[PDB]
Amino acid sequence: METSALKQQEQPAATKIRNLPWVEKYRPQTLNDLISHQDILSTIQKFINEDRLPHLLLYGPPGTGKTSTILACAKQLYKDKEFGSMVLELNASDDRGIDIIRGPILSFASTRTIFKKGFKLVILDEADAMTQDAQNALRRVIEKFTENTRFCLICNYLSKIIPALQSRCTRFRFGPLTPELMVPRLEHVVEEEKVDISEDGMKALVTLSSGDMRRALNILQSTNMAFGKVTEETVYTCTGHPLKSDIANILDWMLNQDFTTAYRNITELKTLKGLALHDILTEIHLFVHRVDFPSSVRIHLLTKMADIEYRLSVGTNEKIQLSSLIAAFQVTRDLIVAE
Amino acid sequence: KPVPWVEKYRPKCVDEVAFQEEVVAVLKKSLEGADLPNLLFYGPPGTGKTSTILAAARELFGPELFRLRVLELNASDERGIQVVREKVKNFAQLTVSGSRSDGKPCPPFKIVILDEADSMTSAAQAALRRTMEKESKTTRFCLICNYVSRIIEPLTSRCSKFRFKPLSDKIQQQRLLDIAKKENVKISDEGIAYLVKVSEGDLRKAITFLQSATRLTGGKEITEKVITDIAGVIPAEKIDGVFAACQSGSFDKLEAVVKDLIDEGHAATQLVNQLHDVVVENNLSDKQKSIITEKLAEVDKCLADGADEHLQLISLCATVMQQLSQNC
Amino acid sequence: SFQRVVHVQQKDDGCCLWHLKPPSCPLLTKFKELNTKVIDLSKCGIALGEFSTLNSKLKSGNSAAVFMRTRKEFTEEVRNLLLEEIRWSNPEFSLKKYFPLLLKKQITEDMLWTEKYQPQTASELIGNELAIKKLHSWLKDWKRRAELEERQNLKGKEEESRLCNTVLITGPTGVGKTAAVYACAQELGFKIFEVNASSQRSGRQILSQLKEATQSHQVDKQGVNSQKPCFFNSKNATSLILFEEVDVIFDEDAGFLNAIKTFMATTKRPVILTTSDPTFSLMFDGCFEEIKFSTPSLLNVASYLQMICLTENFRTDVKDFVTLLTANTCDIRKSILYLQFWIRSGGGVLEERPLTLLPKCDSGCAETLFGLKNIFSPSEDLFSFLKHKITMKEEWHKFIQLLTEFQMRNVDFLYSNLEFILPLPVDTIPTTAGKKCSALVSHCLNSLSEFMDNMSFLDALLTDVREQNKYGRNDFSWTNGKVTSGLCDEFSLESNDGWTSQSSGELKAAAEALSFTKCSSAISKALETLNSCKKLGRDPTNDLTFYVSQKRNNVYFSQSAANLDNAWKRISVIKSVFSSRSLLYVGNRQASIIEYLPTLRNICKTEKLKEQGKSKRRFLHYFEGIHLDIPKETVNTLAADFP
Amino acid sequence: IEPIQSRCAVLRYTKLTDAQILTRLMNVIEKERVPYTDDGLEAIIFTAQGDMRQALNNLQSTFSGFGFINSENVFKVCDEPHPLLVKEMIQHCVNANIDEAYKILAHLWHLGYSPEDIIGNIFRVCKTFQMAEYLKLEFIKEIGYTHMKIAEGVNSLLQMAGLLARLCQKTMAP
Amino acid sequence: SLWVDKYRPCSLGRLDYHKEQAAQLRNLVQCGDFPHLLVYGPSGAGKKTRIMCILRELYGVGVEKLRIEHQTITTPSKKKIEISTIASNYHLEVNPSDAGNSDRVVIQEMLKTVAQSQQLETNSQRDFKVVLLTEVDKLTKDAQHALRRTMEKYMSTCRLILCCNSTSKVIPPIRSRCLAVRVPAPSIEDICHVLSTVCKKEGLNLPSQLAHRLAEKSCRNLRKALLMCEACRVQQYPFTADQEIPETDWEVYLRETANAIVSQQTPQRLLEVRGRLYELLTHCIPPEIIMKGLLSELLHNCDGQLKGEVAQMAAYYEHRLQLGSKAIYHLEAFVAKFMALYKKFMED
Ligand SMILES: Nc1ncnc2c1ncn2[C@@H]1O[C@H](COP(=O)(O)OP(=O)(O)OP(O)(O)=S)[C@@H](O)[C@H]1O
Ligand SMILES: Nc1ncnc2c1ncn2[C@@H]1O[C@H](COP(=O)(O)OP(=O)(O)OP(O)(O)=S)[C@@H](O)[C@H]1O
Ligand SMILES: Nc1ncnc2c1ncn2[C@@H]1O[C@H](COP(=O)(O)OP(=O)(O)O)[C@@H](O)[C@H]1O
Ligand SMILES: Nc1ncnc2c1ncn2[C@@H]1O[C@H](COP(=O)(O)OP(=O)(O)O)[C@@H](O)[C@H]1O
Ligand SMILES: [Mg+2]
Ligand SMILES: [Mg+2]
């Protein structure tokens, strides 16, 4: 029940004199305004304008723009005098069991409209959190009400959705947004907001964001407020992400020094900078395919850090796992350096 | 009726916490404005992060309002993120009137202290981020993690992050002297030094072991034996005997030594820890060092998977045996 | 507001680590440039059968083989020959008693075989003879009591008897508890008032609508009396109250145990409780006679089902029914119903089998039960497809689908039948040439040892479809294992994953298939050389035979490689021994069994050997001499030997 | 629950044979007059592993979205990782060539496919790949081992890299 | 009423060996606000007798009365389970491991009801009810997390002694808040002393040679020593210094199995040894116990270079065995790999 109170209060909510949520500044409005995934949006426009909209499954990593897209589609299909009469919005906030599917959903999909005649629509945000029996009733309520009401399923993990439910709808994946298309957006935000930023700043902003403009705006917002300047160092310090120079020195210590010296240096740096061994493993793996090695070095090293990433999951001692991480390089690469 | 010493002896106020200077300065400035940000305390455990946040909440609010306006939870729940999210929603939704007789009214936002902030997945942490943005104005949080690196980026962009470096051994030796003199227990300074060196810079575990030792002894002298076996710390001549058996050339005395270790009740994990600590700072070859340490790592995995202590120790000693006897 | 979340780290000057520069060593400055150039997929088209079995040729006429089978009714001679074949298969079965009853029962249908061959008489039940005699004697005593009370009524106008008014029937599912109750009540003229969990059974309602059944006479003592009204709320006939699944209790079933306590407390008519769980005996308080139905013998119910199919003009081998029953864990109603389905479908496979110990035999209901006929061709046999070499892509997908079907039940089909499937001889338990013998043995040994390495990898480092030890620990445990199914209507609301089940089943199927193909091919390649060894005069085939049990040899295929009768008897022995009052407070269970149990077996065998020497009788007075109330059956069982 | 089985006859259905699926799809495109290529047929069936409800669904999606049936259209609407790419992955594994296989795996990663469908597609592509049976057995057990890593929670590029490395070292190590 | 329970010490001062930490436990119960205890040591070293002695010291002798109560609990997955627990008016006894993956469930509600019992039952003796969790090493990770949540919710309501053999599977947060009590195995002379004590308490006198031989054969397992001594008593009314001390029958069946291992290396021998291990597992012997016994048997004939190799393959295969569910596959994998190695070794 409710929780639409907080969203409706939140939409025109800002201090507007001191708060500056620039993530909330730049919102696309319609499919012609969402400048990404243009094939998907044009396909939606084609299916809408032919009265041939199939059941939809919009899935992808969060923040890629599924909810605003389907909100634009809903406002396009139906005017503001009949939007609540034809579109039902739900999510996992109102989880009481499977009674949602046989309650509001089954009652809503079983009736005609109220004022004007036309096909209806239900959007189910975060439908991955629906239980297996809830989804298993949801497939039936789709099957026996397919001609009256179309269904939109907003999801984040494709695999968990039961096969028949993905079978009765077509699917659209909101993939990561390509960096070549995301650099002009951040350049526009920077020039509009008079921000000093270098090329490593753009590179770190797009690399950390992993094709999400919301998360990029969050990072640049935080760095601009915390420092007033944005670069690789300022972003990574504000993020608390591994600095590339630091992990480069970590790699240098395993590839040049001996066991004990590199061991205590990396231990002191982890204490000094607050790093957990998972992220060192990720960033050194990012360095492995870039630094030139023979193939045998690459397979042996990759297998060993894979097994270390396994062993770190169960929750063993991180100290001995760091030691084995140094040992992986000490076995092969430093022996060849001696050679 | 009585309380453990760790909360009994934690500082009441910020400025009473020692060894941290920029942390005290920024927390004091945020307390002066009566608008504490969302905090993110990272550092080794026992460094005083919970003590600092309790002191800050005690300074900002009233002591009778302190426990009312804080809710202490942990985040590695075996029932999922939905349960703790529902508790957070229940605590934020439930509002109780609060005032201070000291002349200053309390801020409207409450405090939820959620520890182990480095232990969740990215999905649960993003759910906590949505919960964060749900209650941005009416509750400000303090996430305590061992490592700031595991924090996903939307949280780290809106939280004031604070490093808590471990304290130099002299100052918590002085603090443990203060605890000993205020808790009327006879301890030699060598005992306090041994308790520090087996505490490995963990003041909270140090004072926990101290209270436990003084209630074991019942007022007697806290010897080095009782603090040797209250932390599970293996005697070092046992480690030396293990290395001597590995150097010796006989597997019979190897399994005899392992039997001596296991029927003594000494756990395999602590043995692996001290064997590793010896091996990392030795004159052994880096080839041998690497082979032994990767064997140690996989043995740690095996024992964490439920394998026998005895088998893993025999195989570990066999590998160290072969590595030592190859050069001989 | 948007305050600045400043990074507060304690940067002291020095420590040679706070401000770092990229290393000047040449290896780490040699960053290879990254290339995203993928091969273009618009140029390359996917061929037919590239990722699957899309062959240009298609089979026509092999499938869609309609049966249209018309079973001619068997004459007297061929039927009697089949009766004598059954008798020679099962010499311990009284065949001549049960077949006229089946002929009378059989003499356009609209009703199931379970109620067609429903036993009218308690003597017609199969198995659990002691239990049905005890129940029949109890009901004879109760009808004699009712008749004596009637004689007292016409004449007017209990520590010796120990006629307890209530009996608890317990046993496995479908063993015939309800059937035996119906049969004995019908024979002795009882009128059953049935109380089920399917109907509303709340305490006030059941008391207000069933108390006068046992507190009064019956208004219709003559005429239509042997009918069974299911109780619900939306010669003279004596009443008989029956309670089916007392273990199933709902929140709607409020105060039911207290209600039935009041019933047994105030009854004057016989009350029978039946259930399947063993735990109901301990949680329920009261005075009641207990009757246990064990699992019936496999060969007896096999002969009974074979008489049933013989009456319906079908001849079938015993071993197929043994496989079907062991697949159903000797469940009579399951095997009867699936036999009814498989018979009225027209039979599985028409293969003639001349046996004296005539119509064609109809072996093959076992693989039809597991759905293997939906995978293979009707000409293909299971073990025949298993024995030959697998090279065709379609044949290998059928073998994948076969293993996928058996791994949904978490059953290792290839390993539980490893002796019957490996290219080596199998038999039931009752020099440079020598270097070549030992070498061939060593290659076969290396192949099988690699195979056990693989299947150990499939146990540990492959997940299972169903998570094992979910409610108990691993099998062969005396702690519990009485995990009764749920009793509440609230849904689970769990967060399990299903993708890692459907994918994992195929994962273990493919791994098991490739490992077994590899090891079988290696054993065949090693055994190809055995002809030269036989020509050399030495035969190491005694080292290559597999000694299997007679019980495992009686089935076409096994779903398990172990003995469960032995497991059940040991587990009952240990549970009964550590139920003793003196040992009832032992905490460490593994220490309990592993320490006390062998020593107690030593004491039992020592007492037995002392009694074997014609010594003093007081050697029998050890366990009772230290108040060990261990029953003599368990003492004798533990004093036999350690197998 | 067990007595519900015990009071019934239970029958089993299997994933459908590809020849049967091919017959039903040519039947429905005959009854619908659908322009097509064979490329679309193997694509549309590969997207429907024995479950032709997927086959008709994605057939309708292809015909409504593009109007012609070929492999590229199917993989634009179903959005799977491409079969030829993962066939190239395991072919590079046969050659033990780590560089290209990792390069295009990173390409699939920044394309945005999840860990689970990549490892599933890797399974169903090295299943029917034309190569040696013993190395096929090793490959299957290795990809299952890495799939257990994703299934237990840890699902990163490092996991797929170690996957690929052990796959590649299986060729060089006898 | 054997020798281990009839002659069990009842108070702390009646303990015969390891007097010092018994006195420290007396100091702990004298302080009156002891936190949770974890106790550990090898089997037969005297953990449970120390636990019940500090229990009897803690409350009155109402600890000494014991009954059995049965608990039926619905799962979160809605499948109820029934377990048997030992109970007293002052303490409770739970071994949760019988629930398997549902150990976590067995963690909360009984203790919660014990909390409710502490909210219900008032005797004005002490402000908590103690419960002994047995075999906590077999608790799963989520079960230990649920235990941590239970203890950081009900620290002022109930207490818990943690009987285990190894704290390896104990996660470090559980080790952080519970006081460690290492209970080492008794020495040979201590076993002989308490053995002569229990024989004089039985009115029997034996030579010290039998006591020392029995102490060495028991391998510092005092419970096994007392049981075996009782077996020697049943064998012979008088005690003679050369009385044949009996051998454990599954141990010697395992020894004959190992004889079949080292004797002949044939696939028929593998299958018959597999049947022997089937007989052992139907006798409900734990798989790690079977493994430890068989490896200790077979290592006596192994040469120096073979012993180490057998060690790491045994540890690796038992790592998979605890990783695995059905121990049969792992045991057969070990035995077949040892066949391969051993056959490869006598041939060269
Ligand atoms: N392609 C895009 N271009 C511009 N803004 C975008 C784009 N995608 C997302 N956004 C922003 O994201 C906001 C809401 O997007 P959402 O639909 O909520 O993202 P999502 O993909 O549905 O995943 P969630 O909602 O975070 S779980 C919009 O108001 C935009 O500011
Ligand atoms: N021993 C048997 N002899 C003859 N027919 C039997 C036997 N056991 C079962 N049947 C048949 O199987 C049918 C079902 O038996 P039931 O008595 O209903 O099973 P049950 O013993 O009550 O176990 P439940 O109720 O499923 S827990 C009977 O009606 C008979 O037709
Ligand atoms: N700098 C300090 N000044 C004063 N007391 C400290 C300091 N650091 C640690 N302590 C003591 O150690 C204990 C640490 O407890 P806690 O705040 O939980 O540490 P953490 O949060 O780092 O785990 C506190 O109770 C406090 O008494
Ligand atoms: N001081 C003692 N006097 C007599 N018997 C003892 C003594 N200490 C230990 N024991 C015996 O040793 C056995 C050890 O069993 P238990 O108490 O369960 O400890 P553990 O858990 O280590 O096996 C007990 O049966 C007990 O009878
Ligand atoms: Mg969204
Ligand atoms: Mg019945």
Numbering used by the authors:
A (entry chain C): 1 to 339
B (entry chain D): 36 to 363
C (entry chain A): 866 to 972, 1049 to 1098, 1119 to 1195, 1296 to 1418, 1451 to 1523, 1632 to 1844
D (entry chain B): 178 to 351
E (entry chain E): 2 to 349
The authors write:
Humans have three different proliferating cell nuclear antigen (PCNA) clamp-loading complexes: RFC and CTF18-RFC load PCNA onto DNA, but ATAD5-RFC can only unload PCNA from DNA. The eukaryotic DNA clamp is PCNA, a trimeric ring structure that encircles and slides along double-stranded DNA to promote processive DNA synthesis. We show here that ATAD5 has two unique locking loops that appear to tie the complex into a rigid structure, and together with a domain that plugs the DNA-binding chamber, prevent conformation changes required for DNA binding, likely explaining why ATAD5-RFC is exclusively a PCNA unloader.
From the disordered-PCNA intermediate state 3 dataset, we derived another intermediate structure (open-PCNA intermediate state 3′) at an average resolution of 4.2 Å that contains a 5-Å gap between PCNA-2 and PCNA-3. This gap is unique because, to date, all structures of clamp loaders with open PCNA have a gap between PCNA-1 and PCNA-3. Unexpectedly, the RFC4 (subunit D) in the disordered-PCNA and open-PCNA intermediate states 3 and 3′ is occupied by ADP. By contrast, the ADP in RFC4 of states 3 and 3′ is stabilized by Val41, Thr85 and Arg239. Superimposition of PCNA-1 in the cracked-PCNA and open-PCNA states shows that PCNA-3 moves by 30 Å. In the open-PCNA intermediate state 3′, there is a 5-Å gap between PCNA-2 and PCNA-3 (the PCNA-3/2 gap). PCNA homotrimer exhibits a spiral shape in both the cracked-PCNA and open-PCNA states 2 and 3′, but only in the open-PCNA intermediate 3′ is PCNA-3 free to move further down to enlarge the gap. PCNA-3 is made highly mobile by ATAD5-RFC in the intermediate with two ADP molecules, and a PCNA-3/2 gap can form.
